[PDB]
Amino acid sequence: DKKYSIGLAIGTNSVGWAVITDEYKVPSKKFKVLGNTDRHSIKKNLIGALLFDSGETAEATRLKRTARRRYTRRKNRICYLQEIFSNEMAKVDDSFFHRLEESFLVEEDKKHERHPIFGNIVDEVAYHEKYPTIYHLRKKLVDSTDKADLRLIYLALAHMIKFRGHFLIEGDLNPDNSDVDKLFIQLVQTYNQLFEENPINASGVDAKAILSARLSKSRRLENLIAQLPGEKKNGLFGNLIALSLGLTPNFKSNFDLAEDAKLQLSKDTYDDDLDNLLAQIGDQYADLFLAAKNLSDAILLSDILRVNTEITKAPLSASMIKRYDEHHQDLTLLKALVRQQLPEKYKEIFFDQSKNGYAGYIDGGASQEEFYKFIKPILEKMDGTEELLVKLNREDLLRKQRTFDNGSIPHQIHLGELHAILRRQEDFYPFLKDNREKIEKILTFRIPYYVGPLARGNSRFAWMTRKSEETITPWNFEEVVDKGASAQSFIERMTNFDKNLPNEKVLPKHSLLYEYFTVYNELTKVKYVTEGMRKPAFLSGEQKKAIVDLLFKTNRKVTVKQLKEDYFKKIECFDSVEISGVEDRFNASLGTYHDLLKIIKDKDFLDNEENEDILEDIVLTLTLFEDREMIEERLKTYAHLFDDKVMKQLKRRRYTGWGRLSRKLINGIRDKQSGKTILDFLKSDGFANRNFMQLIHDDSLTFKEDIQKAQVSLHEHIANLAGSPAIKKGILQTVKVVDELVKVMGRHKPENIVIEMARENELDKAGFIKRQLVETRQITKHVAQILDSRMNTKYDENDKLIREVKVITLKSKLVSDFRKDFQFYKVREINNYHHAHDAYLNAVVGTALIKKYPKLESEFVYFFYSNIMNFFKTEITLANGEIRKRPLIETNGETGEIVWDKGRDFATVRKVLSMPQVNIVKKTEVQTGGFSKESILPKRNSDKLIARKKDWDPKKYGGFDSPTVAYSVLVVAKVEKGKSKKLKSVKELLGITIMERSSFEKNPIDFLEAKGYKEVKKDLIIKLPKYSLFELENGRKRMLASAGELQKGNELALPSKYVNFLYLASHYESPEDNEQKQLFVEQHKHYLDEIIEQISEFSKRVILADANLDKVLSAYNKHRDKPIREQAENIIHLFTLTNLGAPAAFKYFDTTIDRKRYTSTKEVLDATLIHQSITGLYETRIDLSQLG
RNA sequence: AAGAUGAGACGCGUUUUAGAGCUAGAAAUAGCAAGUUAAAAUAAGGCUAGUCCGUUAUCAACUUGAAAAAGUGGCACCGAGUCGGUGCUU
DNA sequence: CGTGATTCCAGCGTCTCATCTTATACGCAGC
């Protein structure tokens, strides 16, 4: 048997594989070909590449799922509101809700009157006259006190609930506090009263302009400070301003506090932080802060709301109505001005829905920005146009009610408006008064981000824990959903498990047990050297306890000097002691211990072991939750041990982060023979003081065996890796390709497996060698480990894996240098063979390296310089112009095996690179994704429209188009051809769309009979996924891009000379070498027309693009006078014409050639279909012309 | 510092319908109006009936296994336009 | 009256939170 090696090159969209025997020669083997064709054996080289579409992140799918949930919940909220309105609306208007529901149907299909709101034309007209927009209805309901019809109330409430704005501001906003300057003046006055010693000159400073400017918070703060030379941005007044702006000021400095007084108004915890300020400095500032809070409100209302507050308590409705009136006035003025001045453009602006005029801005498709762009030169051309220009410069001209920039509106405004409306109308409708709280809750309720979807055990994203078997409505959310359990699971389901105990769960970062473990583990390897000691000795358990009590339990940090003085000098009376294993200070510290000692003020409580679990239940509680209410609820169980002040301090205290070792791995498991745990051993390990690594790697202790036993699917193992989904797909395809290759070579595993991943998108000499050899990226290490585990499964009796297969890792830079140094150039656009070529080179390089320098295996699985690939060079430069020669045959001195034959290896490499047949295979994959193009098309008399619902005929209501076909199906059956319904046998591809895929797979016979096919041969059905391969004739092979489109599937085996000439001429990436290359470029410029001739021949044989090829030839003849480099680059562009895959347009100089599309699939019905294996070696050819 | 994964939310957009378009012109076609908004859906859909799930990952062919997956393909040499030819076994 | 050429077009803009993970250095400890 011939032992071989496998080279692999992974990439986002390609996986190159190569099999090399000795002398670095790709074998050529005959493979049997199945099918009903006539061939029985085909020759194939053992090198190739696999092509596939890059993997997609779940980001888009997650966004779509979230949108689905949001729409579902919105509809549920509407349903709740209607249910509240059910009986009363039925008393008032029996079918009002029904008219609301069928509003989308056309008049033919409506079961009620076409007017939803009133069910009659006259009332609808009158209503539309009275309230031009819904905001008029809202303003009327808020302001008027007269009893209103329940339908209008429902419409206003539904408009509020359905569109409620964001929840980025919590608490009460007090929208009446809209005084941008008066509140500022009041705050300044209060500050001056509290700081009469340091008054502030607020005169001459416009608070409104600075604070309501459409700029960043920092910029406006700096602008305000600039007008106050005596005050700074970091000053107390400056920090109050920053807090009003929504920043995070640090009051610790201004108030000289030890606690970091970080306060932000938006945060729910703000009030509690204010309470902290109510416990350190005093209450005199409270009103001050309140004023600042009020100031903040005005700022938040400044940009969103531009209206007087005294006129009404619904500022949003007033602002919308004012904007509508401004729009109306500007529209009337603009119409008058256009008719007076430019009557010709009047039709273009007020009638052309296709243009970007007002007709297109309203009725057609045109944004506000687009409309402004269209209209601005028109307004400048006209005269008497100043107000409109000012508004356009302000982006406040002809604005609509429902614009894109309404997302800044806090839900508090809607809540206040709804509350006001309910209060106004509660005197007329008892149920509104009774269910006011319910509607307020519906408006203000959210599913908390830490609860997750309210599933019932049917979801792969859900962790919500219930309490009772009922329906989670917003009014009984707390009664049903267990907030504590759900919030704990929301953290636990995504936390890393212990590496040594995969079933167990890691401990928090600041656990007292974890800190103790770190302290003891660091203390175990501590040695002390004194005069009376011959040899340094480890610290005894009693000594360790004494040190911890003296230092670790008394100071937030422990230093080397503190250890030397406070223990050896004080207790041991050691005046000279040296400590090894630690420098500077000690990284481990009892930060949690000192913090809890500060808070609860009971050292004995901490020192009691019986409290340990409780202590853990505190720290975990201080890590699981971020809401202070949840933390308080959890700590209420332990509120009996500590005073309310301690409870408040604990609620304030909240640290995050998680450790890396579980509790069972520290204090859970106990050694069988000794009866001691890991913590027990760390507290007393005799005199050896074995640390955690020694304890877990000790063959004499049960811990290692327990770890091994507890430590006991390729796809799942890959899905848990860290990397982009495309790279993970590439890794999986690489592994399956390795499996296929092993099956190919007679099930004899290769000696070496070199792996290189392209890209995401004396001691010094030894270090440089290590840098050039090791692969810094860890995903490469993961892939190498996976391949080593899969290929190697022979662990000897000494508990060591027999390395029958050596996984090597290599970096792209070395191979690229090899290519560019030995003129083994590549062009990305010519063809895909480079992928396989790269793999081959990788294998060769790797193999040669492991042959030449076996001792370096540990670096990636001798000389005086740091170079490692230099021995391939036939001639070596000594960096001083002293060109010398290496031995012609390079061999390892110790072994004596020949590792490089310059007289044969270079020629063999050239031949392998020049081999015309390369196993390029496009990974056939059933396509999935959106059912079609999402854009909803208007009703047309076309059959390509796709229904958006069951009863919505696309001829009337419009719908989707351009469906995506997953895989085609070749059907041989009969149809009712002609008027006589003659059953003519037919053979054509039928497109299986993603929408219809399930129906077809459930019952193909009925699905095919539904589309008009009769007498279907069930066994003759052949499934052709996307990129299925067909051979028509004369070697013309095409990939089935869809049910009705083909792709070029043949590659151009360009001679290496042409490739090198193209690389050198175009400057794709030693002056004498450059001059020689230029001379060769000119010499092959004499040959340049040969490249064009080869392109034309390949196009005639396989492409059949007559018009495009003729235009290419004409343009080339026209541009023959162009410089050689320009022509070379343009021909590199020309390579797009014949490159594999979907045809693409290109540009030869100034002539643009569009893509030729093979839109007919009639020919492949009589061609030979090919099933290429994963590596493409095992091929199954079926002659489709023998069917039918 | 960067990137990935998941959860909770907003604002649009896009379609059909509701916004009586008026005058004259046999009709077609011109002139004159208005235009800002609202409802429903926003993947068809499924049952596992939940404020659940539906665009990520997986997938050559034949047999088996629900399916994850398992089984299924001789070697050497010469050359190379997509792989051919020659010798042994079969 | 089908058929090759030519052209048009595709849902999108934010916010909050959590879990991470890498990415590379440094120091300590090791079986």
Add this chain to the structure above:
DNA sequence: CGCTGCGTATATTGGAATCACG
């Protein structure tokens, strides 16, 4: 030995429509 950890620092391509057009 190489790993094991502990800590610190931060556009594209298929569909679809239309247009000569023999």
